[PDB]
Design an enzyme around this catalytic site. Sequence first.
Site: not given
Lengths: 215, 215, 220, 199, 199, 201, 204, 213, 191, 191
Positions: B1-2, B105
């Site tokens: 997940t950005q 991540p």
Amino acid sequence: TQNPMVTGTSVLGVKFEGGVVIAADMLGSYGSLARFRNISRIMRVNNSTMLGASGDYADFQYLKQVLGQMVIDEELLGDGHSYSPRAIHSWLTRAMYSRRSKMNPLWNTMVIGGYADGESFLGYVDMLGVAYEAPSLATGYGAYLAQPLLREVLEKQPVLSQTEARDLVERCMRVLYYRDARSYNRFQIATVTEKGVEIEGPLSTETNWDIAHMI
Amino acid sequence: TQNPMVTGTSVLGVKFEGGVVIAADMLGSYGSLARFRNISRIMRVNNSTMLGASGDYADFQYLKQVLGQMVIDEELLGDGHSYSPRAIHSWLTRAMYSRRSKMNPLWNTMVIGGYADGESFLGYVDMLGVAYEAPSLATGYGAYLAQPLLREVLEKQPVLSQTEARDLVERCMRVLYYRDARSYNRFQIATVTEKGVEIEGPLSTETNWDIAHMI
Amino acid sequence: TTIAGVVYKDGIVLGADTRATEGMVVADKNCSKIHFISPNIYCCGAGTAADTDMTTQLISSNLELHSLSTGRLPRVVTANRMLKQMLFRYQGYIGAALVLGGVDVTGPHLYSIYPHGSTDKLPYVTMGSGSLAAMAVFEDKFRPDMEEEEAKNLVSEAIAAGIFNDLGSGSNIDLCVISKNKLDFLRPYTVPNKKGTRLGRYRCEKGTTAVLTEKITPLE
Amino acid sequence: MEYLIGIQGPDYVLVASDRVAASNIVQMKDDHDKMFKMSEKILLLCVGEAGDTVQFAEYIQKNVQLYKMRNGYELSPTAAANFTRRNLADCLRSRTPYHVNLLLAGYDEHEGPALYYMDYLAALAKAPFAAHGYGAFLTLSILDRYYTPTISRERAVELLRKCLEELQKRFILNLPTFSVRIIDKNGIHDLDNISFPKQ
Amino acid sequence: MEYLIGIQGPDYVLVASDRVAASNIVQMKDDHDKMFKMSEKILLLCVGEAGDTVQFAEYIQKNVQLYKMRNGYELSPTAAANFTRRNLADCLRSRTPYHVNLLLAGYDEHEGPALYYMDYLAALAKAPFAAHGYGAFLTLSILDRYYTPTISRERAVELLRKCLEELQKRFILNLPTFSVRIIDKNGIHDLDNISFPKQ
Amino acid sequence: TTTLAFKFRHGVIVAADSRATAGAYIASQTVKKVIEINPYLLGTMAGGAADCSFWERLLARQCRIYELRNKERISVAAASKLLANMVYQYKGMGLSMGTMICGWDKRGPGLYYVDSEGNRISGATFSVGSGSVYAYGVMDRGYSYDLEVEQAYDLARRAIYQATYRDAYSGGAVNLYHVREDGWIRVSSDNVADLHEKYSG
Amino acid sequence: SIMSYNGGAVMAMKGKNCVAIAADRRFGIQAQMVTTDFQKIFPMGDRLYIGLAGLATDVQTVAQRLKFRLNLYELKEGRQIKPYTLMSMVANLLYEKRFGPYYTEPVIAGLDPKTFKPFICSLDLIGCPMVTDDFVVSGTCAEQMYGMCESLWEPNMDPDHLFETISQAMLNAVDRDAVSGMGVIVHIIEKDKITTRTLKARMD
Amino acid sequence: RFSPYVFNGGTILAIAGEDFAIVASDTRLSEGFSIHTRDSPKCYKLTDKTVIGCSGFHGDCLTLTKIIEARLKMYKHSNNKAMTTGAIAAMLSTILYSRRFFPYYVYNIIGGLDEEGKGAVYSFDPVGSYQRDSFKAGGSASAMLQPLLDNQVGFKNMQNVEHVPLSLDRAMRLVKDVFISAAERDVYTGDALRICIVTKEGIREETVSLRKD
Amino acid sequence: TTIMAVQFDGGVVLGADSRTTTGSYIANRVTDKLTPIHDRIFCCRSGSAADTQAVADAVTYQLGFHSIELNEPPLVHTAASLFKEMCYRYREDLMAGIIIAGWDPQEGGQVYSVPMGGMMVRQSFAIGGSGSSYIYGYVDATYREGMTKEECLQFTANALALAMERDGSSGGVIRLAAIAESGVERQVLLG
Amino acid sequence: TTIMAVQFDGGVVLGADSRTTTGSYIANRVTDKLTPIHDRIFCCRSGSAADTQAVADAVTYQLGFHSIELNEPPLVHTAASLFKEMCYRYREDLMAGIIIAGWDPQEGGQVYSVPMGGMMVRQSFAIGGSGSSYIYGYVDATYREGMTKEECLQFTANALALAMERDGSSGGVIRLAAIAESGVERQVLLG
């Protein structure tokens, strides 16, 4: 003004026989929020001319103040001389140009309507100083939407009557309520004649939705 | 997940004599907006361990799903062997590291609490894979706020009882309600003992506003 | 570019304007944005021309294939579904502003496609750069279940107002009418503009230009 | 770009420069002069941003001539060098900076010879042999190999000959002709122009 | 950086190059060779991104040797030039582009002499005299001043002498020694090495 | 745009082209680039049109004032110095100006080169402009000091022809001025295509 | 602009029974010319040419690529190719590089293989065809050639006035242009024969 | 961000005759992909023998016109006579350079008679250069119009075509043809064509419409 | 943050939270968000803190000097004009959400609003602050023209209650102010 | 834009506006914002349009194939899981505000919400869309546990009414949906 905080929306104006009618609505929008649902976006200048504007409302309050003071000064000269509407148009153009030359623009889009000495007048003033005369003006999205109605009826017949003009303005404001996202169903009509300057009340529209019964 | 969309907030966990207590609140804030005021941020894993997390809630749902499936798989082995909490901690650490090595991540901050074979366990897992054991854990702003209370009382006395631990957690959650902007006066306490894993109900805090009468 | 579509009491009237601007210069005075899909379904394009062209030729090939495989008349919803699935699969890179119209067993159906894959069923649509003027004319003078000549006059009026307003609009005006049986397709509907005859014959003479090297190659 | 060398001796200063005036890619002028005679025993050379060189010569040169005509006598080299450093250090922290990099060369009756060393950041230095540029790199090893503080002037001329022979050997530039001065107790003596015939 | 000139004649091709190998600022090697003998009458020179030069020599040289050993005979200069252009044009639109800029020089028994001209964008050209680089600028006026399509080879050598005399006159670079080839009906002939004496 | 100037035994030659483009588009073909300052000075046009015209016109103002104050016509180096001093006060603000100053002196011939970067140097040969390197090549071929008149005319005219033949921005008409001891004198105004006919055969 | 890297201008003009295509000769890197004999008009069979303008890499690449597909087509089918077929082939070849685009603007001018009917069209860098009746142009100096052909064209033209019209148009539109010049080659073709003339353009 | 300039477009032509100076200009004032009006003449009558046209950014055109008229009145009230054409050209060059570091986005064309009674057209650039040419076309349709005037007025690039002096009505049909031909391909060419003719007897004007596209 | 002003027949009623935040940390739980300029005129602030504090102090200066020089009680529109001038003149550096309210002897109770742009408008009720967005529904549904004082207090209590409940930045404790001819009545409620 | 779902004892009730906007121009005044998937399960969408249309079509595909293969009516939590997987898996390209509601034979009426992240939660009522922020006050004020059907319809009518009144993007016309065991009852109201 670098970033306009509280914007208005489109202003419509069109000449007719011995007068100019201008109508703009009464909504003060911030972003997408219709925050101020009762404001006045037309100043009734002294007896021969009349102003309507778009863009940042605070700058419009500022120019309202300055123009009011200038008109008060000439009325206190007591010479019997007034400002022609074209003189006001010229002064406002010079004001916007001196704003934008110093990289501090007044975020507006102003329409000046006036009737003096037999001749109607309808002037335009942009933020960048672009200024001209026209038989029908339309700002913001009005230049995309209600402009072709004005130029449609004015090409088939160049002059008008007051009833036809008012009806056409009503139809154009109906269309702008239809397809502006920043629009509102409450507008006021302002009119100049030889009898003076008159502001009508917060009228509304009659809409159609019979396409919704089509699935 | 950005970009983490829907974040939780701080999670508190502390060992005691033959058990580990963990408490986190029940709020699902989006930005500054407290959008989801009834959600669960602690999974009661099978009988020996227990999970609580922070950060993006969707990733917590994902790890909830995967860990539930892994626990179901070993319980269907039927061998009489379970996962120790440290094995789960190791697996989750490897999972986070393999997430971040691929530049994708899982936006979380997780606390693993377990009691097996006489010894308590309280493990930490970061998003970046930083992982360790500690007698008292605190995530988010809890490491800034409720961490000194834990390390204060634990330095004066290294072991605790269950009542003292629960009372200390209550005081720390009161403080986090006092000075976290993304916080809420509703929390649930989760507890592991040798008797199993127990989730208490949505408790609240008792506040003091006697500083407001000082002008 | 100002395309429009409408549904009258029986079928569909589509329109176009054939000024293909390239930047700021008029590159064409006679083009064709009303494309073939099927014997009953047509399509109009806007924005990037070659994207619309290649996409509409691919979908017309696939639907001709499907119709010849089935053995009956195509459906409009199938064209819509193929187009929206392809344009969403390209993530909005391909710019193709489409108006889709045809008459199925169910009747007339008009769809407009925005180049990401968002579609709508509407009784009347306008797309393009000058679509706002035609949508103004539509909202002014539309009524449900119009007749044929009323709808033709309306669409001609709308695209004509778009040409007398918009700057990327302005040429001779294309129309197309689809019924359950009668398909029509016309090159100049109403030619609003003329051109002044030249005032000086600026004709060159036979030899007014110096020539350095000639070649002649005969053929059959 | 280039470098002009400044070897100091026991009782003389051996300064030199080029005759090169750079452009886009062309060598516009092959007889250029970088020598700015401040006084009878104080020289000045200048390399940097090439619009500032002449104006520095204007400022420094004319204010030194003002001091000499006012009070009746010549500056020390040290005070003149410090005066240049002061005008650099004042001109640095403004809206109008100057970008030059040159060493200063003087001679006192009492202090004897003196060599100073600037930078584009207005730093004083009292050097036995100094440099700037890209010829700095390829030349200070040769000079620091063959240096004696008590060295005679013809040995210094031979050393400079050697230094030039290593300038025309591994450089990406042209540098065809060098002018060479010397300063003594007698004043400014111009030595012969140091060129190589090419073809 | 530099340029290697390639003057075409009536029945010979006069190509020339340097012996210069650039660095950061130092001239690392002063006897470099850019000459890649493709066949008995086809030469190749190369200037560009200096990691691609050797690999281009590998690819082109070895594939031409493959054609010659396979089919029994030598390529035309035209097809070889076009083959180089094809490998550039294929290698351009990829993740691994090559950045070189040279002209190719050949000689056919039937077509006679031939000169071609690439670029880092894979463009063929059939030129009477061509250029690349920075010596391109200061040299094409002199060469286009003194050209005759029917010019003899000693006049071409004198013209090249003159062209070099304008290379060493207004350039910001060194360029001390040039190697010179010639191509005839007899094959590849080497002329004397063209340098100018420094000291 | 390609100008050149070189001095010799009998004074100074100045020649230039007359093409002044705008990006890829040519504005005019007859832009008189060699700006006539005085009956004894000649300035040029090197890149900026408005800037060169304005600042050289201001220099002419200063020179005429100087003459009326000193009863003696200004030298060339003094004029170049005044021009450089007036240009330096706008460094970095985006002036492009690379002009040349020519004239006759008490010392005789004078040839200077003034930049918007403020470079001021004397010399014997110069060439300014985009295709100036082309003029440098054939000029530094044919240059000497002991030359005739018609030799210098043919040299300068051929030089500008070669420059406009190679460069894309240079072109139009080849002007040709000649600075003497008494005053400058326009020689001729020759078109390119006429020179192409003259030198192609 | 990448389109303004090497210059270039191609004009095609439809006459009465014949068609004339012309282009410039100059090749070079942006301000530096190199040669005056760069080919931009290619023969594709008899009485049918193509003109290519823009970056020279894509010019030679698309010309060879098209010659490849063209000979494969003319060998799979014994007949020669119709101009609409060639237009669609060039459109498909350019659209295969939708996101890897060539930098070229092809101009096709040729006659009918069955009748003497002329044909002109032009394409964009992604494959947008455009058939007209008067003229198509391509290159840097577009607006000049637009002004010339909208100024000088007549519908029914004998080949002499066709040649002089396209000659005057190319000469004047090129002379106003900077980066494109150095000679003009003109191909004037008809049902019977093919004529190629080169004009005395300004070599500046 | 706030952009200080916008391109309003317009097309101004000038032709210097033996004893006449014709200046013509379209009257469309537009912005982007819209039309603000269809009547706004770019020509302005300065003196009895000088007409100036101004295209580009419209507000700077209006400001520049008013400043030029003011300085004309200043010259008159100082020196008992009107300015010449070249005097106006020099003054305008000084003005256009006097805002160098915040430039006018304005193309300028001055036509008029000299003091000998001959035609003189002084072109300009936004930054302040000028030159005495016989014909110029400024604005958006410059490149559509310069080579055709080179073909007809300048007689360039032709062979065995003699040089005839340009008469009046021939220049008129030229101006009408070039505006029709440029209005076919341009997006900024107006409808109303405003043709100003400066003779030795006053100023004439003439309004010729076009296609209404 | 969340500030509110409602007029009624006799006078006006104000209200605010006190959760003054900085980033994600609560720096101060309780704050005097409303400020007495004069004894009958209030202002409640939002946006940045230092900007509004300096503006309110300078307005207090000019208005106090003027109202002493008049030797008459000041108007509300006067103070609104002063905030308008100082907001509009420096829109470039200030972030003020100033809402002016107060009873007046000549004009009764009035409420003026000055948002970040520096415009000035008279309203019958006002919504200010970043967390007022979440109760524009409730203030348009529940408002009825002609409430009493206790109904306005209950109204603003429910308003700021829901605003504190929903917004993260809002919270803390409720401060109220009731202004009439009879006096100023401030109290601190929770519920 | 503004979408709403309220359950009651017997079943669920949905609602949305139709004012689909693009930038500042209204593209369509009337839109089926709520979409049938199965005969008892709806979804109402927000955010971008093309994303939600393609996702709703693929979910319709997978859910229809599964419910035919089950030979049983599907669950609501199943369809919620499908939207959860497709939203969460490509949170890099989608902007989905999908709200699932529908009556079920096994579990009665249920309402699920899937916001832009990809989380899934069960609620008793839901607020979706950019203009729902303004009526979080009204829905946390007027809601009462255990309404009837007509009270839920009146509730969502007033809700979407106030949302359309205040927000600029919301507007158009009101669409409702009533789902119970007895059927689906759709109507278009205004007021």
